[PDB]
Write a protein that binds this DNA or RNA. Structure first.
Lengths: 49, 188, 25, 240, 120, 150
RNA sequence: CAGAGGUGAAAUUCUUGGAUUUAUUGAAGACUAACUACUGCGAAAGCAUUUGCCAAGGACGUUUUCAUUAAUCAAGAACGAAACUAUGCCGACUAGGGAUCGGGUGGUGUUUUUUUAAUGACCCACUCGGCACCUUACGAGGAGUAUGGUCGCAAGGCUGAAACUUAAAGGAA
C-alpha cells in the first residue's frame, strides 16, 4: 500500500511529507489500524546491519 | 441545454473506470447525465430534459474538474454537496529562487504531514498541494482562511503562526462574550 | 516552537482526524 | 443595511423622488443579423425615448450586441462559440447589425487544454480587401499518433516555429483573398480549421486547430447602401 | 414569443449582485444586492439574501417584459479568488423558481492572461 | 574535461589500421599535389584542403596518400602561414566578439566568453613561442587584431 | 439607483457632483496565467508571448588540421530581510536496470505526399553525451536533587493617619 501511495502522489505530483530514508511512510491507514505496535518503525535488523 | 467537458490523464483513467458506476449513480440521483470517453481521455457532463437545477449542473462541472484533478470519489461527492466549494490557488509565481520555493511549500505541508492535518482539521476543509498549485475544497469560510494562510506561507509567515491564530480565534468565537471587539489584544 | 499545547495538537492531529468517526481540548 | 444597524453618512440628506419609471418611458427595438447567418432575427433592446431621435440614433449606432452562435445559427455544434455584432443603421424599429468580433469562451478553452502535450499559438494582423483591418488568433494542440507508447508527444522548437510561420502564411493568404462577408461565411462553417490541418499534416501532426479569437481594429467609411444590400424607402400615412 | 436578456451575477465571498440587462448590455433593467436586502451587515452574502434579491429583480423583469435570460455568472477574479459565491448559486436557483426561463448559463470570469504582482 | 566546458564528450574520426591507400584509388600522387597547390592559391586553410580532398576525389587522407602532412607539402611549395590556422581562427573569434561588445556594451555573457578566449589564446601563443615556431617578441593585442584582420 | 469595500465582529473609506456594478473604449507602467516536468538551458547568481538582427557555446557525425600544447591550483581577475525540521556514510568504482533529453546509424511498416518545394511525425534495436531514480560487486557532557558561604531578594499590619489615636470620603464587613 505504501508503494501504491508514493507512486500515486509522485506520478500525479502531490508534494508529501519527507519521510526519513529508513522508516515507513505514515498514513491514515496506519494511524487507523494501529499497525506499528505490531510491525514497528522500521526493520531494525536492516537498520543495524 | 448545457454541458461541460474536462480531460484526465491515464492513471486517473484507471481509477475513473473503477468508480464510474458511482458518479453515474450520484448524477442519476440529481438527474444529470454524464459520459466517459477513454479514447480522448475526456469526461463530459450534460443536462437532461427532466432536470431543474442549472446550479447543480454548475456544481457537476466543478465536480468533474475535481475528479480529473484526482481527489477521490467521497470528496467528489462532498463537493457536489450543497454548501461547499473548491478553489484553485496559484502559488507558483511568488518566489524567484527555485530551491527557496520548494523549501517554502515543503514547510507549508509540514513535517510528517502534521501541519497539513492540523490546518485541514481546523478548517473542516480538504487540501491537496499539487506541485505548483494548491487545491482546497470545503465550506466557504474554510476556503477563505485557507487562501489567506497558504498565501502567507508562500510568503514568509509560518503556518505555525497561522495555526495558532486560527486556534485562538476558534476559542474566542466559541466563547460568546466578545461579539464586537478587535481581538488584536488576544491574537499574536 | 517552545509552545506546548500547539505542538501537542500538531502531533495528535492525525489521531484526532482518523478517530473522529472538532475536539482537541 | 437599510435598517438602523449602519450609521448615517452624508448619504440621504435629500434624494430625488422615484417618480418617473424610465421603464414607463422607454421603447422596444428589434434587431436583425447580417445575411451571412441563417437565423436573422435576435431578441430585443431598449432606448430611452425618441424625444431626441438624435439620442435614439446615436446611442444605437454606438450599441454593440453580442450573441450565442447557437441562437444565431440554430445548431448546437455551433453552440460553443460567441459572436459580437455592431449596430450600424436604424429604420422602422429595426436595427440591422454588422459583424464585429468572434470568440471562444473560457470554458471551451480550459476544457481543451490538456497537460501532457504541446500548445501552439499564433496571432496575425491582416487587411482584408474590404479595407477592414483585423486580427486573428488561432491555437493548436499537438497529439500523439495511434502508433505511440510515449505519454508526452512534445514538439521540437524548430517545428513549432515552422508551423507558426505556416499558419501566419495561411491566414494572410485567406484574408487577403477574402472580403469581410466571405470571411465570416468561412469562419462560421469551420473551413480554416481544416485547411490549416491539411497543410500542417506534414510537419508534426496536430489534434486541435482553431481560430480562437477575431478582433476588428478600425472600420472603413460607413456605406448605408452597401449594408442595406448586405441585409436585403417607405411612405407615411398622410395623417391629418 | 420569447423576450431575452442577459443577467450578470457577481458572486463574491462577501456580496452578491444580480444584474439584468438588455441583450446588448446597455440599458440595465434591474440591479439589487444582498447588502441592499438584508439588515445584518454580514448576512449580505447569505443565500437567503440572494434569494430575496433575485425575487425583486424577477418582479421587475416580469413587469417590464423580460422572460428569458442568458445568465453569465462571475466572481471577483483577477489576482484574488476566482470562485463564485453563495449568492451566485442561490440566485440562479431563485431565478429558476421564479420561473424566468433560463436562456443559457455560463461562467465568465476576470482571469489574468498574466498576473499583477511582484516576485520575491 | 573538454576544457572550460564540463561536458566530457568524445566525438572525432578514427583511423583504419592500414598505412596505405585502398587499392581502388588510382590518382596520381603528383596530381593530388597540384590540386592541393591550386586550392591553396585559391585561399583555403589546410583543414579545408583536407576536407575537399577527402570528399571530392576519394583521397582517403593526405598523410598517407602523399609522403607528408599537408602543410609540410605547403612548406615544400612555399605556402606556410604566418600563424597556425587555429590561432588564426581564435584571432578572428576574438575580433568578432570584441567588435560585438563595442557595439553592444552589455553582453556580460560575451565578456565572460572573451575571458575564456583570451586565456586559451595566450596558452596557444605560449606553446608556439616555446617551439619558437612563432616569433618570441610576438604578442596579442587589439592592435595586432585590427592590423592583421583588416 | 443606495449603498459599496472590508472583517470573526468592526471601522477607516467612496458615496446624488450617481460610488460599487453595466457596455463601449483610450491611456499608463508593470508581469507573461494556463501548456509546466520526471525534463531544458548557463559558470553560478539565473532563465518563459511573437520576431528579426548581431555575437557566443554545448553533444553528436568526421578515414579533416595541430603534434604534448595539459592537470590541480595558494594568489589575482571575472561576474552576484533572511531564517524556522531538513541528513545521504564517503572514493582511484563493477555490473547495471527501467524511463526520459540532445544528436547518429539500421530496419520497418503507418502517417505523411504526387517535377515541387524542404524526406518529416510514430514504432525498434544498437549507439555515444546530460539531468536524475532505483538495485547492486570492491576499497585507506547530558540529567536532577541537595544547600547554615557570598551577593542580591524583599515581609506584614484597613485608607487616610503623622509629631496628633484625628475628619470627610473609601475599602472590606
Amino acid at each position: 500500500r505504501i508503494k501504491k501511495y508514493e507512486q500515486e502522489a509522485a506520478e500525479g505530483g502531490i508534494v508529501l511529507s519527507k519521510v526519513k530514508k529508513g522508516q515507513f511512510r505514515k498514513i491514515e491507514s496506519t494511524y487507523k489500524k494501529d499497525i506499528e505496535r505490531r510491525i514497528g518503525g522500521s526493520i531494525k535488523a536492516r537498520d543495524k546491519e | 441545454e448545457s454541458s461541460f467537458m474536462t480531460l484526465f490523464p491515464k492513471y486517473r483513467e484507471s481509477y475513473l473506470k473503477t468508480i464510474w458506476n458511482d458518479v453515474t449513480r450520484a448524477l442519476d440521483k440529481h438527474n444529470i447525465a454524464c459520459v466517459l470517453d477513454l479514447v480522448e481521455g475526456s469526461m463530459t457532463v450534460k443536462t437532461t430534459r427532466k432536470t431543474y437545477d442549472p446550479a447543480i449542473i454548475l456544481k457537476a462541472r466543478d465536480l468533474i474538474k475535481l475528479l480529473a484533478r484526482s481527489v477521490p470519489f467521497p470528496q467528489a461527492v462532498k463537493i457536489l454537496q450543497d454548501d461547499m466549494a473548491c478553489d484553485v490557488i496559484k502559488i507558483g509565481n511568488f518566489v524567484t529562487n527555485k530551491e527557496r520555493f520548494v523549501k517554502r511549500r515543503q514547510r507549508l505541508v509540514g513535517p510528517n504531514g502534521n501541519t497539513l492535518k492540523a490546518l485541514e482539521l481546523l478548517t473542516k476543509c480538504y487540501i491537496l498541494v499539487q506541485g505548483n498549485t494548491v487545491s482546497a475544497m470545503g465550506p466557504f469560510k474554510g476556503l477563505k482562511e485557507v487562501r489567506r494562510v497558504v498565501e502567507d506561507c508562500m510568503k514568509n509567515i509560518h503556518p505555525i503562526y497561522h495555526i495558532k491564530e486560527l486556534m485562538i480565534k476558534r476559542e474566542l468565537a466559541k466563547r460568546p462574550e466578545l461579539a464586537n471587539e478587535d481581538w488584536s489584544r488576544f491574537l499574536p | 516552537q517552545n509552545d506546548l499545547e500547539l505542538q501537542q495538537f500538531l502531533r495528535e492531529s492525525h489521531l484526532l482526524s482518523a478517530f473522529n468517526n472538532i475536539v482537541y481540548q | 443595511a437599510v435598517g438602523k444597524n449602519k450609521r448615517l453618512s452624508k448619504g440621504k440628506k435629500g434624494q430625488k423622488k422615484r417618480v418617473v419609471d424610465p421603464f414607463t418611458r422607454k421603447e422596444w427595438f428589434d434587431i436583425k443579423a447580417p445575411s451571412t447567418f441563417e437565423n436573422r432575427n435576435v431578441g430585443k433592446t431598449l432606448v430611452n425615448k425618441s424625444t431626441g431621435l438624435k439620442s435614439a440614433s446615436d446611442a444605437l449606432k454606438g450599441r454593440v450586441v453580442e450573441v450565442c452562435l447557437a441562437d444565431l445559427q440554430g445548431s448546437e455544434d455551433h453552440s460553443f462559440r460567441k459572436i459580437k455584432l455592431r449596430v450600424d443603421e436604424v429604420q422602422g424599429k429595426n436595427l440591422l447589425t454588422n459583424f464585429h468580433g468572434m470568440d471562444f469562451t473560457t470554458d471551451k478553452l480550459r476544457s481543451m487544454v490538456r497537460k501532457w502535450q504541446t500548445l501552439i499559438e499564433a496571432n496575425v494582423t491582416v487587411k482584408t480587401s474590404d479595407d477592414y483591418v483585423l486580427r486573428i488568433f488561432a491555437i493548436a494542440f499537438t497529439r500523439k499518433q495511434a502508433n505511440q507508447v510515449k505519454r508526452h508527444s512534445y514538439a521540437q522548437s524548430s517545428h513549432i516555429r515552422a508551423i507558426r510561420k505556416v499558419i501566419s502564411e495561411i491566414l494572410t493568404k485567406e484574408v487577403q483573398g477574402s472580403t469581410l462577408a466571405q470571411l465570416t461565411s468561412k469562419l462560421i462553417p469551420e473551413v480554416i480549421n481544416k485547411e490549416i490541418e491539411n497543410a500542417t499534416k506534414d510537419i508534426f501532426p496536430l489534434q486541435n486547430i482553431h481560430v480562437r479569437k477575431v478582433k476588428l481594429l478600425k472600420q472603413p467609411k460607413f456605406d448605408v447602401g452597401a449594408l442595406m444590400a448586405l441585409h436585403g424607402e417607405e411612405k407615411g400615412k398622410k395623417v391629418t | 414569443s420569447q423576450v431575452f436578456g442577459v443577467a450578470r451575477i457577481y458572486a463574491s465571498f462577501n456580496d452578491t449582485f444580480v444584474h439584468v440587462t438588455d441583450l446588448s448590455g446597455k440599458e440595465t433593467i434591474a440591479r439589487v444586492t444582498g447588502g441592499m436586502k438584508v439588515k445584518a451587515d454580514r448576512d449580505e452574502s447569505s443565500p437567503y439574501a440572494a434569494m430575496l434579491a433575485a425575487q425583486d429583480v424577477a418582479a421587475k423583469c416580469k413587469e417590464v417584459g423580460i422572460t428569458a435570460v442568458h445568465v453569465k455568472i462571475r466572481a471577483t477574479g483577477g489576482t484574488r479568488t476566482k470562485t463564485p459565491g453563495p449568492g451566485g448559486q442561490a440566485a440562479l436557483r431563485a431565478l429558476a423558481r421564479s420561473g424566468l426561463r433560463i436562456g443559457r448559463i455560463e461562467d465568465v470570469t476576470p482571469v489574468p492572461s498574466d498576473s499583477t504582482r511582484k516576485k520575491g | 574535461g573538454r576544457m572550460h566546458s564540463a561536458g566530457k564528450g568524445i566525438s572525432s574520426s578514427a583511423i583504419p589500421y592500414s598505412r596505405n591507400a585502398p587499392a581502388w584509388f588510382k590518382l596520381s600522387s603528383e596530381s593530388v599535389i597540384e590540386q592541393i597547390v591550386k586550392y591553396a592559391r585559391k585561399g583555403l586553410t589546410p583543414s579545408q584542403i583536407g576536407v575537399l580532398l577527402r570528399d571530392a576525389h576519394g583521397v582517403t587522407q593526405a598523410r598517407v596518400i602523399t609522403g607528408n602532412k599537408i602543410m609540410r607539402i605547403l612548406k615544400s611549395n612555399g605556402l606556410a602561414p604566418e600563424i597556425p590556422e587555429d590561432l588564426y581562427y581564435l584571432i578572428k573569434k576574438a575580433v568578432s566578439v570584441r567588435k560585438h561588445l563595442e557595439r553592444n556594451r552589455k553582453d556580460k555573457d560575451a565578456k565572460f566568453r572573451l575571458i575564456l578566449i583570451e586565456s586559451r589564446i595566450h596558452r596557444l601563443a605560449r606553446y608556439y613561442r616555446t617551439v619558437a615556431v612563432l616569433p618570441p617578441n610576438w604578442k596579442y593585442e587589439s592592435a595586432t587584431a585590427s592590423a592583421l584582420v583588416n
